[PDB]
Amino acid sequence: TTGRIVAVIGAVVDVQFDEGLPPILNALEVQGRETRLVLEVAQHLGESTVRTIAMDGTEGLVRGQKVLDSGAPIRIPVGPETLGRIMNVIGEPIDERGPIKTKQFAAIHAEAPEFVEMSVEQEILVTGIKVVDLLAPYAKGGKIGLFGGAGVGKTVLIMELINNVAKAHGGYSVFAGVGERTREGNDLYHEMIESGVINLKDATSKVALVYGQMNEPPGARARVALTGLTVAEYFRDQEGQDVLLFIDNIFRFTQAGSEVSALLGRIPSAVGYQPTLATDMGTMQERITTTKKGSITSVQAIYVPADDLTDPAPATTFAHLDATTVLSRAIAELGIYPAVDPLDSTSRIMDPNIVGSEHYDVARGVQKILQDYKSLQDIIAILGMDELSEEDKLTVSRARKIQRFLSQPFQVAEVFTGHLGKLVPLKETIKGFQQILAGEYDHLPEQAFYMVGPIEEAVAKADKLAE
Amino acid sequence: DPAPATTFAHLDATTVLSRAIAELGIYPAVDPLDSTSRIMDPNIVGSEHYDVARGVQKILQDYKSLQDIIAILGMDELSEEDKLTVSRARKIQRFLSQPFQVAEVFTGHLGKLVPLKETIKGFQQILAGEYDHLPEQAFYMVGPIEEAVAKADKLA
């Protein structure tokens, strides 16, 4: 059936249908455009008029322009043929390499896996990143979140994880560029051609790419996460496979919705957000999961507006994760990278019955000395260092060294650090911190521990700093 | 506040008055670190005028950074270098104050007008350490630097 545009205000388009009314979520096709313009049905307004959000710019649209119901939600190509390819929100290839010749398509809207489909298996996923591995380790098939304000290190950290984990991963990866920088998509694309995880010449590609960046209007950024997710969902079920899912940045899904919320006639909730913020996030996040049929390891970069972790968006995201890495501008300001707050990062598998009591005891030991040093900071900062107990100033020196030993040169960060990147195996991370806690390096200066890999490099650097 | 905030960009010179400065008795209550001029440029006012100004502003900013320490612990916990910045800055703050003809009822002093060259010289001299021997109060509510000196002598 054919409908007619009746109103255009920004991304929001009202369309009147005289015959059959397309159900909410349906994809409509705008007639008379150069490039395919999809509108997604959001509301039935009454009087045979639906309200839609556009998946591309609405410039050029005329009241009365014809619109066709496709009969279904937005359906995208899914399967092996998406590997090596770049799609947009609506499953069109954006890599100028022609058609995506899949056998099947999948709607980007779908029901969340039921409770009975849940898995409880959790084994550690080592990253080679000291602070993560020690204090708040990732699990295979788990939900990982990287929280951070603007410019604190989410993307560098996620690129390091793709470098350390995805490169050598056996199964398939999905990366969804969601409301982020096009420059970063081009960067990542050519780094993966270089490293061979994407092959443009044969069929060995292990990564599918889905992009809807900050050059796109909100309707596109609001759905493009769903698009990536759906690709991953296919590889999880219709192949039963071990899938890695990377999303930078999942906040941009929620921000997109806030951009159109008022035009959809919503009373704003707190902090300017849609009232539906949490349910919207719910029906989306509950699809990003491991089930009995297959395993998704999801890593999601999560923007923190105005640096405030209580902001409804990141605040509501926390409950959806099994491991949280929280990045801090205060720490990054110090030159400590990755800028992980070791007193605000958590993991479900941080449990002596899972990681063993050795891993656990050192982790809790590290946090205690950092918390104790923190509880002395503001105090001695004005009351004098010499007025301290001989075991207080021993924790102050040890915590200052542990703070530094948590920092690490990233392979991905070589253009920022000037240091060659280091990957530190788990046992070496445990050992190193275990040793600093026991007093083994009180003779070594602070700076020896700054920006190094394993503990032997802190020793090597200590010799080099002498002369 | 949107109203004042939006006005700044319409100005070639801003004089920002401060209630905190006024409450300290400093009149005119000018915030010497929040008032700016588009002609405060060595090529327009000359390098001497420019240098003394930047100098005064630096010593006032250095003083400001020390004030958290001062408020809790006091003068006595400062290095000798800091005590000197504090004493010079506090004398500079006072020499920025001036009796207005228009406000004679409130000051209890005769209104004063200081020629530019003499303004530059007075502060040039305080910065050079030339009156580190004189008391603070001597710099308060006077015109030219000579009046500060004569006020110090009168404090017997």
Partner: peptide, 22 residues
């Protein structure tokens, strides 16, 4: 004077006047 500070102008006062004790 002594090793311990945070006691007003005790330490500075003798130093202005000035092998030492403290």
């Amino acid at each position: 004077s002594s090793d311990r500070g945070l006691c007003g102008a005790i330490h500075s006062s003798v130093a202005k006047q000035m092998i030492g004790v403290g």
